[model samples]
Target: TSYAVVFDAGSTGSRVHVYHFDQNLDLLHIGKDVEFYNKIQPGLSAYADNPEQAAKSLIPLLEQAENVVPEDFHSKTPIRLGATAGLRLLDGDASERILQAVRDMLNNKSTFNVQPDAVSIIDGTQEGSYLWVTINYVLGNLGKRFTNTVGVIDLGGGSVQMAYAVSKKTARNAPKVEDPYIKKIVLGKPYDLYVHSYLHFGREASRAEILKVTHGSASPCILAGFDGIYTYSGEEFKASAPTSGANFDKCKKIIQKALKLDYPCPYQNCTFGGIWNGGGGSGQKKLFAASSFFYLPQDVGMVDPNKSNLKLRPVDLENKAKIVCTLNVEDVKSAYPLLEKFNIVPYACMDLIYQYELLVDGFGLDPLQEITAGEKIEYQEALVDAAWALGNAVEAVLL
Candidate 1:
């Protein structure tokens, strides 16, 4: 059994969870406290730029929380810190300054000595990608095999990440492989992996941009030249007209314009030639973009290279997912109207995790049950560790 105090330094608010680990050192959430940001903007960079203001607001709340902790447990509690997309916006200097203030505030209030260098900054892109990589590693450990090198696409509120890599191998042909890339970050160790982070790919920012480009238009048929697909329930305008007649004349034009085709589909011309429709019950499955053959092993049998439909398919999701907000079903439903405000939709993480898990548990390569179990365990551990690590990392900024 183990005990640790973890901090989730999220964009919307800061939270502390006291966890009681079982025999395996796995966490069981025992208690939590939340402090909303009074001075900082929830989804913007202004909050991150001003560390003094952040500390002034967050410190008092943390002090109040400390008053409630049991005296015996208070003295020896191990605290860890983690931050998400909001903090990622800051450069190293700005982030450190803000985090330093937080560390100072916590240390000043504590009865015993706590070093400011104890806390650190946990990178959200790294955390999400770490979760993705760890799951793949677990799949290999369970004997699951994949044909193609998969890409981990994480869509968060303030940023997005794309990480692609193969699992670590212990032997030449061993099914069980370890992914050092993500494990180092998530497990607070070191690793080598190819990871890229893009700011503002979160649902909120993307939706705003999409709306700006499409202007509340209905889902544009991929057959048309528009990249923005519509999903609003009230939308009635049916856009079937191609943006340009020349768009149909050459597949190369579409590939050049569409951004999603870059990594997932590598073919220069006929990549991702399938049509998909968004919204409502059993609507026509629009064949937008589809490839005839799998260019990457991950692409196998999904599309034909020559005769594939070269239409783009974007999901029509009404509920966007927010990384910093509560993810319970009820909370998410209630938060739907505020999607534009938060720049996020609901169930996005769930869908992403599900897809990632499925890709790791391929057919006939290994036992799905074992692979799934291992993945679940690894992901859960990573989340908890991430939260804790972020808490501690932020503390380091104080010094």
Candidate 2:
């Protein structure tokens, strides 16, 4: 057996997943789990001015990866770090500096096999493609006919990704204006993927966008008793609540504007913000989503956090939104005991409404259509996290 280490450098946190794979590249259990997962907050982007510091921020996770994989496998294990929206949003050459610093650290400090192209900022399309690979691969949907694959919508902290397999005819017809809308990837067989990453439309980034549309004023989306400022990338926005507290209708309006839902769709089909929707078919009929899509619902008891995955309709999220809509922060805490103090509870109302709107109104998923979502997927009695990290790990073995 060999190993692969994948790091997810996000806008909010940094995470490392160490996967043990058999000679056949199938995942193997290390201890009680299929992979070792750990994370830290205040992402590498927090050290924008200090590239060395940005590289050092991953040391904690790196140490965990080193410890999780056996000593003998260290030299052979492939390692990679994929930075997402936070780094991409940086100005000038700061992102390049941060990435170079990371490359130097891994190449000079770690024994793992580090490739020159391993450390870089991933655009929305690649990120979306990786997500599709992650979900469908875990579901064992890869290597099957394109239509057998499941669609994926990963609502990360900084970006939202919608990806799925599409027919060759559909792939060929994808609008040229949206360059790279189609990605060709191989697992056990060749596949044409329809993937789109909506930059700044992620859960947390959208909060900043929602606040931007509100023009820094108190928003009905925020919970009462909480007045605060939110910083994303390099900008700050007002997150203060209205004196009347959270209001569902008011919150939905700003979210709509933030999503550019009314934007023109020049293609044969489109989602919100005038983005291509990949012309849905059987590939999209079975859908799965991850990241904040899982966290937010888990926060409100809509889905049990203990389970690996759950199937719920978009309206279920809508129903949950109404419960938190007008609740004050303290009341929300008391009512939704599962609501962790993750710095997002103050805007849970906004978060909830946006999630439903994105699905029903934005992406046009059926309100009552069941979609699978959770942090992990179970395989052979072992749980593997449903994340792009695993897909990266799998690709490392092949590469």
Candidate 3:
């Protein structure tokens, strides 16, 4: 058996996935057979100034991989670390320092084989493209004579990504975009995909943007009984609710303004912030939204917790956001006790509202149209995590 280990160093946390596959490149256990999987909080970006500490934090995850992969395969097992949005936010010099520290540690300390470009920060465009490949692979869209692929929308902590396969005619007619779009041959078939990542539109980062736009002023969108201080990207700011109480309409308007949809759109159709969305061809796709797209709905009771897939409409999310925004912090706690554990009760309103606007106004998805939402980051009980790591691993071996 051959093995592959991928470390997804995300902004919110770091996760290691140890995958065991046969000589034929088929998984031994599929979803049930993730030899080892673990995560650590406060991501590598937290130790920007102290790169040594950042390198140290990966030790535990590396140790887990050592225990999982057999001794004989240690030298052959390819291990890679890919940092996402958090590292992208840092200056080039600072980012390289962190990567160097991690590279040194993995090369010297870990038994697994680390390639020359094994540890590096991935840009938003690659992140989206990889995820597009992942979602398609998980859904059995690849490796078939006829392909049926789905689009993906990932709402992370620092950014949001949208990617989908498009017809050749559509690709040729689509507006030219400087952002990364990818063409790949999978299972002997060619795929032209439109993928783009928007920075500062993620759930957490967008909140920070809204806070900054408001100049730290009190707002009804902050939710009642949730006044406190919060920090983002090294700056501390105060968070307080409106004196009158939560106002859903006002909050929605403010969120829409922050989207900056008024920019001059060169294309006939654009998805806010001057981003080209491939005009009409992109709209007719079955979307599978993950990350915050799945989490927020599940938190607000819009999705059934036990099910992996849910069919939902844009208005469904909008209505839920309205109800959630009207509730006080105490009411939220009483309704969803688990949210209090994550301390996300305060941002619940803002998240859902942003998601709605991002879908309808930003992405141009129909308010009444129903889209499939994945619950557990898995697809058809075959793949685990439904993330870019597995896709990256597959590409490493195949391409």
Candidate 4:
């Protein structure tokens, strides 16, 4: 038997994902192959002054992992704590201090197999690859024709990514780009995959960016009766809505600007921000969107949670926004009990609209096109989540 523990250090929070595999290294169902997920806020960036606190904050997660996996597998289980844009953006030696502290914690506290070298900020280049592989592997799509593979969109807290395999002809026509964009990859079969991570365009990052684009306080994008200071990138900004409350069309205008869709595109084909769209093709026809993209639908009852994945159109997001945008903050909260503790209640409309605008205007996806939006997918009698952790654990832990 085998197990992999991957701790993702993200901006919005830190999460621990543990996967269980049998001797064959194939996923073994631990109650329907459901994963163990643990999360904490502030991430490593908050512990710039006291790195120990950051490392210690993860103890509960670590202990949680220990409690679940069989005792004998402790030393055999591979554990890798990966950092993200959150730690990468940290100033000075703070990032290093926090990493070393966690490494020390694993050494002293954890009995699982550990790799200090893998605990650094996960490279952007590796991110899309892992994310792509994680889903494809779970769906058993690897080693298949390019058209057989599904495209992936992961909208995270600190960044957003779009990836899909393209034909050789389309790949060559792509404009010259740097790493983490277009890369020739071989996974069972060859794939010219197009991937990009927009660092400041994530769900949380957009909140601040949207406010800035609208000149902050009393903007039409924010919900009425909610005036607060939003912290972003180690700084604070004003956030307040108009007395008349958020207006769908007016807020849409601000989101359009914040998207920077008109940025200079030297290439013949571009999506948002002058980036290549990978030339739409068969590979992109069947797309799977994870992270917050999947969460929103499940949380809002737009999709069935009982089923791991749901098929829906971007129009649903837009429709949801229109309904939420008109309602005041308190009414919106009262309307959705699932969002009880979410701090995002005030900006619910804003967030939903951003997702809609981003998919349609930014990525050029048809508003009516269906996307498999969910966090998990079933394969070979086990369900799996789409995340870098799965890809990381498979390659880094198993042979």
Candidate 5:
């Protein structure tokens, strides 16, 4: 058996996943840890100026991993480090500096030799494309195909990336080509689906921007939950008391409009709507209502220990526990030290939509609560309203 280490460094934190695999590539055992990243702000501008601070945060996790792993395993084990959109903020020079720092730490001061070629930064756009492809593959495997185009929207901590496609034809048990390069573009014609990258909505930036957008109001509050509508930072969100004024309603309208506009996808040609989002944090239903689009990751749900199905075994639970525990710890801390360095605190809320599916399944709660039976009925009715909104937002705007 041999061990392999994988690191996925992102805007909020850098995660280390250790996998034990036999010659056949079957997982034997695994370990994981997450350390916060130093993304001072949630925008391209913040990381662009002070990338070192953002890059430095990963060092501690490496040190921790070195201590945690067995000595014999360390010598032969291969550790592969990959980063995403967060690093896109840094130009070539800044990126080289950060990459060198990571390399130096793993080298162990000449005590060990790590393959220089082993560490690589994953392309953020490529990741987006891969996810979209995976989604397509899944649908194909299930024998589901729709003429309507398919799109994916990813809102990360520091950046957002999307990849979409049209003219997808899937047949059962057919040889499938799934790669960004293989994604065909229809020349001189609008795509059946389109994906856009929003450099602003990354978690930290979103918080700062949303806060700036809602300052000085009577109930100016910050949102507690992590999801779309629930993840807000303003004075209004902090209060235990409710607001009665027109400002509250006005803000709500603004949020509704913003949510609708954030990941604007024109689904004019497609009759069946298809949309997906992933990252981590809290508000799903609100985002669903706000966008009036079905969110794949949250709405579909995934493997989480909190669910009652008990599908995951003890070991599976252990690995998930490690990652989920890291997210929870980071979320509870309130102030992220690394995020503070570039004066990027009170930054945007984390990806509430990504973590929302777990909330729905495990917690048995919805942030967009229906207070009364009548309200519940209204909530059900809202689906129709959302569809209507989607029709207007998509067809009216696109056509």
Candidate 6:
């Protein structure tokens, strides 16, 4: 048996995943299938000016891994840190400094065998591919005679990604894309995957984009009776009560426009903003959306937190968004008292509306189409985390 650890330094927080597996790459039980999982707030990117402090913040998570993995295997276990969009958005010098600080900490302080390339920021394609592997592997789709893989839509704080298996014909015919088609050998069979990551399309980033266009003024998307300032990247923006009576239709239209759905498309059947999705030849695939995709619906009572993979339709989400958007701030607060816990009630309306637009108009999914939404974090029965860390560890062990 062996162990591998992966640290996911995301935009909002940093998560550590410690996985234990046997020679056959099967996850071993150490009280649970996933050996150790922990997280820290503010993300590594938050300490861009204080790189040493950023590296030190991981000490607690590293201690957890040290306690989980047996002492004898410490020298053999491999650990890696993969920074995502948060670091990607940083200036080159700052990004380099943060990675260097992490590398120094791992080499000088950690017990695990750290490769030279173990700590770095992964590209958008790698991000999508790892998530694809994670979801499919968790669903028992890989390493089988007949693989029935599902696509993944990951909505993070800084970016959104979509990844899925596609036929060779579709891959060949796909327009020259900035994000390439990843050729992966899953279960010893060659599978071509269509993976794309859209920067600034994530929930927080999208909000920032919309606020930029709104000139920090009142918006129909903002719920009534909520008046406060929101900050992003050191810029303060106002969140005022709706000026046009919190119209759901107007909010949806604004979201659609912000998504650039009206852009002229050079490719056949292009999604919003002229992004090509293999021209629909990839066929209908089972979809699993995570992160904000799960959180927003779960907040609106459209999804049950106890459910592992809740089956939902685009129309259902649209209906829920409409209801949330139309409700006054007090009504919404009364309906979802938990919103106060997160203090995101003001943007809840916009979040749901954007999610609906992102699916139906941005991705061009049918309103009646069924998709699964939820994450392992929300359900105890979930065997594996719906995250890229597991997929990274799995690929590392297999390779």
Model 6 lDDT tens row, 1-399: 889899988767788999888887767766745547889997898998898988898888888888888999988888989987567567768888988999999888899888999997886678877888787777767854222678888887768888878776676777775666444556566677778788778888787766655666787778886877777766777777665546678778778878888888888777777777654433235788877788777777775655545778878877887788877788887787657667777887888888888988988788798988766532234356788888899888776
Q: In angstroms, give how far residue 292 of model 5 lies from its true place.
A: 19
For model 3 the TM-score comes to: 0.90
- What digit string (tens of lDDT, one per residue) describes model 2 on residues 1-399? 879999999776889999888987778888988889999988888888998988888888888988888889998888889987567567888888999999988887887878888887867777778778777767777779998888988888778889888998998898876547888888879888888888788887899989998786888888887899988866899889988988898899888888888899998878888888889998898888887788888888876667767888989888888888878999888867666567677878888899998987888899989998877777778888888888878877887
Tens-digit per-residue lDDT, 1-399, candidate 1:
344455556666666545444554333444431211122234223466677777666564355446544566665556555556456457777777777776886777665235554456656445544444433432232122322323334444444444443334311222221222222232232222334444433433333332333344432212222233334322322322234311211222222222232334222121111111011111111110001001111121112433222111121110111121124323433434333343222322322222222222210111121111110122332322212232232222222
Tell me model 5's lDDT, rounded to 2 decimals.
0.35
Window of ten residues with lowest summed lDDT in model 1: 285-294
CA lDDT, candidate 2, residue 305: 64
Off by over 4 Å in 2: 216-218, 225-228, 337-340
Off by over 4 Å in 3: 30-35, 143-147, 173-178, 182-187, 236-238, 280-284, 304-309, 375-383
Off by over 4 Å in 4: 22-25, 31-34, 40-42, 63-77, 109-111, 123-125, 304-308, 380-382, 397-399
- Residue 346, model 4: lDDT of 78
Q: Number of backbone collisions per candidate, in order? A: 48, 0, 0, 0, 22, 0
TM-score of each: 0.46, 0.92, 0.90, 0.88, 0.43, 0.92
TM-score of 1: 0.46
Error of 4 at 44 (Å): 3.0
The CA lDDT of each predicted structure is 0.35, 0.84, 0.77, 0.81, 0.35, 0.77
Query: Model 2: how far is 85 from its true place, Å?
Result: 3.4
Error of 4 at 205 (Å): 0.9
